């Protein structure tokens, strides 16, 4: 489609984005398909087409919603969910409906043996490629370097991605996308203290027991925090599929670079993605001659 047109479902042609008037009328609410702190998502109908309708849950988080919509329009690409309509005045927008839900429910989807054949390594590794391909485009976005902040644990990280009906990974929940400027200082992912090993080590309070947490005193980090969580996401996406034991071997060294304690030594998302594509191709040639 042209830049701001869309063709979803059984559409024969692309339509320009729906604006506030047609959304209030032509978009009818059906079934809630997703909750969240920032949003409520309803499966909906617009002109015989199934669609996704995201509303602002609580007025408390109006700013997060509007910027997530601001970034959603800014980063419409092959790596992000397809936008359908925008009406920020009503704090609401419309995107393409993906019936497989989030990639959080991946193993349940591949359990359905209408999707058993796709429970292969070339599908799961492609999803990981799409994941790193998104992160590569994120850190080099037209809106400057951006950081996927809403990713403190593994499951919340997966909840921000969708599974298109052809086993492709798409980003969706872009409410928290700060920009890393080339000036310095960096960014922070929230106004409260983060903990755990799933977040990057620089995302932790570095002062210990004597100094209690304080938002102004947190130094600040960059996009390498996304590199940090790539193996844990990659480990989930491959699961234990036939062949993934060989793939993790090939990716061990690039796994070990993403998990470096010093962030400036971690590989860029384009460095990670290139290894992922080359391993995919190598095992595609290894399978061919058998
Ligand atoms: C309100 C605010 O602080 N927005 C800033 C924003 O913050 C993000 C933050 O970047 C990340 C920290 O990782 O976390 C966001 O909140 C998460 C939270 O981490 C958990 O995953 C989870 O928490 C809840 C809490 C309540 C509910 C409710 C009742 C209902 C429900 O169904 O789910 C939850 C889950 O989910 C939230 C959101 O996904 C935090 N965002 C929010 C809305 O709190 O970061 C940007 C730039 O990064 C600015 O700092 C914002 O000001
Ligand atoms: N287009 C969509 N198609 C199908 N499922 C969706 C779509 N958008 C959201 N979902 C579901 O809504 C959930 C919450 O979406 P999200 O953007 O992350 O809300 P929030 O910002 O409140 O956390 C997703 O994890 C997912 O299950
Ligand atoms: Mg979410
Ligand atoms: Mg959100």
Hey, what domains does the chain have and what are their CATH numbers? 1-290 (1.10.510.10)
Atom of ligand 2 nearest to the CA of 36: 22
Q: Which ligand is nearest to the CA of 162?
A: 2
Q: Which ligand is nearest to the CA of 155?
A: 1
36-52: b or e for each residue (b if 16 or more CB lie within 10 Å)? bebbbbbbbebeebbbb
Q: How far is Cα 52 from Cα 197, in angstroms, rounded to an integer? A: 34
Q: How far is Cα 41 from Cα 175, in angstroms, rounded to an integer? A: 14
Alpha-carbon separation of residue 249 from 51, 228, 246, 255 (angstroms):
41, 18, 5, 10
Please answer whether residues 146 and 71 qualify as being in contact, where contact means their C-beta atoms are separated by less than 8 angstroms.
yes
Phi, psi for residue 89 in degrees, rounded to 5: -55, -40
Location of structure tokens 């670079």:
257
Report whether residue 280 contacts ligand 1, using a CB cutoff of 6 Å: no
Taking the centre of ligand 2 as the mean of its atom positions, its distance from the CA of residue 118, in whole angstroms, is 23
- Which residues make Cβ contacts (< 8 Å) with residue 81, sequence separation at least 6? 52, 72, 95, 96, 98, 162, 170, 171, 172
Taking the centre of ligand 2 as the mean of its atom positions, its distance from the CA of residue 114, in whole angstroms, is 23
Alpha-carbon separation of residue 202 from 156, 193, 196, 206 (angstroms):
19, 12, 11, 8
Closest CA to 221 of 192, 252, 200, 246: 200
Please answer whether residues 206 and 200 qualify as being in contact, where contact means their C-beta atoms are separated by less than 8 angstroms.
no
Report whether residue 32 contacts ligand 1, using a CB cutoff of 6 Å: no
DSSP code at position 269: H
Chain breaks in the chain (C to N over 2.5 A) after: none
Taking the centre of ligand 1 as the mean of its atom positions, its distance from the CA of residue 57, in whole angstroms, is 13
Q: How far is Cα 238 from Cα 48, in angstroms, rounded to an integer? A: 36
Residues near ligand 2 (Cβ within 6 A): 33-34, 36-39, 41, 52, 81, 95-98, 101-102, 159-160, 162, 172-173, 175
Resolution of the coordinates, Å: 2.0
Collect contacts of 236-239 with beta carbons under 8 A, ≥24 apart. Answer: 236/106, 236/154, 236/158, 237/103, 237/106, 237/124, 237/125, 237/127, 237/128, 237/131, 238/121, 238/124, 238/125, 238/128, 239/106, 239/107, 239/124
């Amino acid at each position: 489609c042209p830049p701001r047109h869309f063709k979803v479902g059984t559409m024969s042609s692309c339509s320009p984005w729906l604006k506030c008037p047609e959304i209030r009328s032509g978009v009818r609410r059906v079934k809630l398909i997703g909750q969240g702190a920032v949003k409520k998502v309803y499966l909906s109908e617009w002109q015989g087409q199934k669609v996704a309708l995201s509303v602002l849950s609580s007025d408390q988080y109006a700013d997060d919603f509007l910027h997530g919509l601001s970034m959603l329009r800014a980063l419409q690409s092959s790596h992000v969910v397809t936008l359908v309509g925008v009406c920020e005045e009503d704090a609401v927008f419309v995107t393409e409906y993906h019936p497989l839900g989030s990639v959080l429910t991946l193993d349940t989807t591949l359990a359905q043996e209408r999707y058993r054949w796709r429970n292969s390594w070339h599908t799961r590794l492609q999803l990981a490629i799409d994941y790193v391909a998104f992160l590569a485009y994120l850190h080099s976005s037209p809106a400057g370097i951006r950081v996927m902040c809403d990713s403190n644990d593994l499951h919340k990280t997966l909840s921000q991605f969708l599974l298109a009906s052809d086993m492709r990974l798409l980003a969706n929940d872009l409410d928290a996308l700060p920009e890393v400027e080339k000036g310095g200082l960096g960014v922070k992912c929230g106004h409260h203290e983060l903990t755990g090993d799933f977040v990057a080590p620089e995302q932790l309070w570095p002062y210990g027991e004597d100094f209690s947490f304080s938002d102004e005193a947190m130094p600040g980090y960059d996009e390498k925090t996304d590199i940090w969580k790539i193996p844990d996401v990659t480990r989930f996406l491959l699961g234990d599929v036939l062949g993934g034991d060989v793939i993790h071997f090939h990716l061990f060294q690039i796994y070990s670079e993403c998990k470096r304690k010093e962030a400036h030594m971690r590989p860029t998302a384009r460095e990670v993605l290139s290894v992922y594509r080359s391993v995919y191709d190598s095992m595609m040639e290894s399978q061919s001659q058998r």
